[PDB]
Amino acid sequence: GGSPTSILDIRQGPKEPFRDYVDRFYKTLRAEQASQEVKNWMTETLLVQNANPDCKTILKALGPGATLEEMMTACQGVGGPGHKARVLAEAMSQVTNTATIM
Amino acid sequence: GGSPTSILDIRQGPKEPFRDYVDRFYKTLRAEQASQEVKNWMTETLLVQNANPDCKTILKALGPGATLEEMMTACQGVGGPGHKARVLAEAMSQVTNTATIM
Amino acid sequence: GGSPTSILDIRQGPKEPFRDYVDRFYKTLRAEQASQEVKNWMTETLLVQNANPDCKTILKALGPGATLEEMMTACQGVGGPGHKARVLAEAMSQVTNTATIM
Amino acid sequence: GGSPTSILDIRQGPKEPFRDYVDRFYKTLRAEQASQEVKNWMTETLLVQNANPDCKTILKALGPGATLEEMMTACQGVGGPGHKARVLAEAMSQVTNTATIM
Amino acid sequence: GGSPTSILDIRQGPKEPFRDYVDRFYKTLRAEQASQEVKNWMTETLLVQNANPDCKTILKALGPGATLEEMMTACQGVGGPGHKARVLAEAMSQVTNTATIM
Amino acid sequence: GGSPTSILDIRQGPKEPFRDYVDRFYKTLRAEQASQEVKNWMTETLLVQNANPDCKTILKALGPGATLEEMMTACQGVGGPGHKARVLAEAMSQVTNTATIM
Ligand SMILES: O=P(O)(O)O[C@H]1[C@H](OP(=O)(O)O)[C@@H](OP(=O)(O)O)[C@H](OP(=O)(O)O)[C@@H](OP(=O)(O)O)[C@H]1OP(=O)(O)O
């Protein structure tokens, strides 16, 4: 499901922010020789799924229609204390209130 | 919204400290050819809004129109045991008293 | 057996991402002059096992059938806020309820 | 209030240890063209104030009159488990007992 | 007894992977001139004792009489979420239930 | 409290391992023109106190009679889970039980 260099073998490091992830997302796409429309929805589906579950959760959180920028800001912070500062608090409240998960 | 290398793109990384983000910001603002008043407010609107939810929200935390010193000290602590530490024990207290959020 | 430079000796770094470790494994694997199928069943048997208990455990966790992509998506979650948030989330309440372990 | 390269613009990176930040301060101070006395008092009034709220709170904590060595010893520990750990332990207990803050 | 570089000094960077440390042990062991066997038992007695108190601890948990491989399977989990996660949960529940220690 | 480059000015980075620090110090000590004996009297008191509050305290923690074997063997874990697993496992029991400190 994606050969080396192909935008399909492109993924946001588990810790890689969206801002860092995104840059290369398209650099490796440019490596892929696909029409814009071919790469377009790829630019979309490959980006988000391969965008590190912290971001995917955010991206999905931003609700569809999100802009590469909107997701970018929310999932950009993914990586440094910018986002993590908050996630430690929420992850913490993810267990305190939501400890029971079914 | 925001072209590459523009002060608009300029986004304090999450971990990106204010003194750091702020340093490349203005170096970058210098790079975008804008009028004085244009850079004058970009220096503002792009510095606080795209200032990494930690620093950014800090500026807003300090209170709007915050003196560069107020956002600087407050955000110049972003990335160190000075501020980062505050986030570890404090967010921890956001879930202690403020865990119930609606 | 499984001395250095062998896909056997190929163990995802403790923190080496499935995206990297897979590359390492697949880089040291190619370096390993094994039959194609041999590499493939190593890719199947060695990978899952010598893949960093975080990814490794996941591999088994996704349940058999995990395409290289499934173990990839699941083991790609591992390494940052995406998954770490969760590991922290469970290791925390596993201790709370599941503290009693026999 | 403080131009670039001036000791006024000199600020201990949040994580920047005092040992590193002191060098950058004085190295930069050398760069700043201020009388020996003017540099000497910057060395005092600037070094402390722009010394990373962590080392900065340590300087005051050591108590005014702290010899550069005193702030150095205490503010040198800033940046690693040396100080960061102590902070984790103190901040940790600052929320346990001191959580109520007015 | 045991000066720098001599395997005796050979120690796992506490965060250093067992695999790397071990490589350092063995890479440097080769550097420490001994009888074939002498280097080997060092490989045993020194490695466990000087391999990151966590791995040092794992090894004992790996079963006195641990093979270099077994500990390799476990200590490899060190330096990674494999262990960072596990330690977090255990230290977490040990203090909670086992808080009273005598 | 020690001139630059002198073994007196030799200080284990707050994160600097004792292994690295012990090595920095001894090289620096050789650089430090302390008599053959003075270096030995330096290698003793300086090495213990300037070696990063984490080790430094450990050195005292090992209790008097701590030979390089004790401080190196303890302060070795400094930097990662070896020494630190204790910092995180015990801190948990240092604040929970010992939070009240007078
Ligand atoms: O110990 P690791 O699992 O390898 O985590 C490290 C560790 O961070 P923590 O303070 O959270 O433990 C580093 O700090 P030190 O071990 O050197 O103290 C830190 O880097 P800084 O020193 O610059 O704060 C770095 O975080 P990062 O590089 O993201 O800023 C992070 O590594 P990972 O999160 O990538 O595992």
Side-chain angles (χ1 to χ4, degrees), chain A residues 15 79 84, chain B residues 15 84, chain C residues 15 79 84, chain D residues 15 79 81 84, chain E residues 15 84, chain F residues 15 79 84:
Chain A
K15 75 98 124 177
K84 191 182 291 183
Chain B
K15 78 191 299 300
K84 182 182 289 185
Chain C
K15 76 106 94 161
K84 192 175 288 186
Chain D
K15 69 114 85 170
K84 189 176 288 185
Chain E
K15 52 147 282 182
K84 196 149 284 189
Chain F
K15 73 104 73 168
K84 206 167 289 188

Side-chain angles (χ1 to χ4, degrees), chain B residues 39-57:
Chain B
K39 289 186 179 182
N40 289 342
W41 83 300
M42 297 256 240
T43 262
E44 298 292 342
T45 58
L46 281 316
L47 180 64
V48 190
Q49 291 181 42
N50 72 38
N52 157 33
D54 199 8
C55 304
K56 154 152 59 169
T57 207

Side-chain angles (χ1 to χ4, degrees), chain E residues 48 53-67 70-71 74-75 83 86:
Chain E
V48 177
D54 253 21
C55 290
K56 197 136 57 153
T57 261
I58 288 174
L59 248 135
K60 285 176 178 177
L62 273 252
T67 311
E70 211 72 16
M71 67 191 76
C75 292
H83 201 65
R86 183 171 180 170

